[PDB]
Design a protein around this ligand. Structure first.
Ligand SMILES: C[C@]1(O)CCN(c2nc(N3C[C@H](O)[C@@H](O)C3)cc(C(F)(F)F)c2C#N)C1
Ligand SMILES: C[C@]1(O)CCN(c2nc(N3C[C@H](O)[C@@H](O)C3)cc(C(F)(F)F)c2C#N)C1
Lengths: 301, 296
């Protein structure tokens, strides 16, 4: 259907089918066991943020790779269940739609993960070239295949050079995996999210240290954001003022999976609504905090 | 009497093929992923169909996108699904299967979905005249013993040439299922059942459990790389060496490949010694391949 010009928030990244099995004890190799419960969930960073944006009240779209089949059909119906626009999916003739097996031990609480295979090709710069960008007001990129994503980010810069400031597409980038290839993405986007895991891997012991130590890696006028679990989150802009919000923990912590993505989508949402960086930081902490005391994404708003 | 019927489960096997078995609390990437129609009686139908035997499957299924995958797979193989007990309540069962590519060890984490089992009432509706052989996968024992009494009752009212041959698989070490030992012309006892009863070899298990079988029945026990053994009314132990592939890559459904191949061979009038050997042959060929294609 007809999407009004400059109305959508696009999230580019991974979508995976996570099969989560709760077991009494970890299975020994060569055994046939019965799980206590099993859940099929749509996962992935960009995919999780999409759900959160829909629940926040934003028209939102997902861009990612899928191969036709029964897995992709489950994932699409789940995206559609969450009001996500799936028209930009980069459908692939070769490879498997990502699927992961997670085994949770009910006794000790430990998670054993069999990650999805490498077979499916990631969204390319040539796939991104074919996209009419005018229906987007904001483009969020989950850092994966960096050399290709750098070109997509250059395409958005070119688009923006030709627009009046009120028709310029805002851009955000997430560096969540501690992979060297990804670190070149700090130099792109108006908003750069760096994970606590990446910061710790780079030798930083706090969100303050990470922001001060990495701000030199960003482009002029960019805001660098770091969430540090129960320590809340910090942001640092061109003015040199380290902004901070304390976490809003739930009465009891139930499910932190995808709380990082909830933070990211809530910060993006709040900024896209004309709120300030301090306001966006606070709101992101409030929404991610509510999420941690809930199973899944129901009732985060 | 031209079709073999397999009564049991149909389960969606969500497979991950790994180069090593994951250590607890670890994170490993898999080599490849695939969906496969599973369930013991379902896997035996795949094998029977590839062997050229017209066969039928009977089991519970719940309508949905997964059952649509399962049904399309059954049809692509020529398996008759007309006998399926479609349920209004319950989800289709599924399992996560980790296959170790370096030794073929398969680990199954099954999600049993409260789907109601096939009952003696469901069985009562079946036209027994189209079946040469009926194989029953041991699940709801008390309810299956009734299904078995019905075939025996049909047999009494038939000439010896028109009798329906019956096989039973006791794969899970559950005491409820030991009453099925019990019924049938051919009884398949697993290595896991046999071990759980204190036996250390196929021959030990057969000598120890023969006392439980029906007059004139053949008790069969496969023992992985040790091949398989069989024991009949004549008291003569029969053995077959395994046919291992040089590289064992996937044992998922090897047990079902063996049961189906033994059933097919016997249904074709071959001796117990030949059927045992054929079972080991097809099961061993399977262990060198991913899935069931290419076994014959
Ligand atoms: C944006 C985020 O940094 C992503 C993670 N997240 C939180 N993570 C928490 N964890 C507890 C465990 O150590 C582990 O599961 C992670 C605890 C809290 C909470 F306590 F504040 F609720 C929050 C919040 N918000 C917020
Ligand atoms: C009917 C069966 O008993 C069911 C299992 N099966 C086999 N299991 C094998 N393994 C099971 C475990 O993963 C480890 O012990 C290896 C190996 C072989 C093979 F090596 F002979 F190929 C066969 C054969 N056939 C035959």
């Amino acid at each position: 259907g007809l999407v009004p010009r400059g109305s959508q928030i696009l999230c580019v990244g991974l979508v995976v089918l996570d099969v989560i099995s709760l077991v009494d004890k970890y299975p020994k190799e060569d055994s046939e066991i019965r799980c206590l419960s099993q859940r099929w969930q749509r996962g992935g960073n960009a995919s999780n943020s999409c759900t959160v944006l829909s629940l926040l009240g934003a028209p939102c779209a997902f861009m990612g790779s899928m191969a036709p089949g029964h897995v992709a059909d489950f994932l699409v119906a789940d995206f559609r269940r969450r009001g996500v626009d799936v028209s930009q999916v980069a459908w692939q003739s070769k490879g498997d739609t990502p699927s992961s097996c997670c085994i949770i031990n009910n006794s000790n609480g430990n998670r054993t993960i069999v990650l999805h295979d490498t077979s499916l090709p990631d969204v390319s710069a040539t796939d991104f070239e074919k996209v009419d960008l005018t229906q987007f007001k904001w483009i969020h990129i989950e850092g994966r295949n960096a050399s290709e994503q750098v070109k997509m980010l250059q395409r958005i810069d070119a688009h923006n050079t030709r627009q009046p400031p009120e028709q310029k597409i805002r851009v955000s980038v997430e560096v969540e995996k501690p992979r060297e290839e990804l670190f070149q993405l700090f130099g792109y986007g108006d908003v750069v999210f760096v994970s606590k895991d990446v910061a710790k891997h780079l030798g930083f012991q706090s969100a303050e240290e990470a922001l001060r130590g990495l701000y030199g890696r960003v482009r002029k006028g960019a805001v660098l954001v770091c969430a540090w679990a129960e320590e809340g989150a910090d942001a640092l802009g061109p003015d040199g003022k380290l902004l901070h919000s304390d976490a809003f923990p739930p009465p009891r912590v139930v499910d932190t999976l995808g709380a990082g993505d909830t933070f990211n989508a809530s910060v993006i949402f709040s900024l896209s609504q004309g709120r300030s960086v301090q306001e966006a930081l606070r709101f992101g902490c409030q929404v991610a905090g509510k999420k941690c005391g809930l199973q899944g994404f129901d009732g985060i708003v």
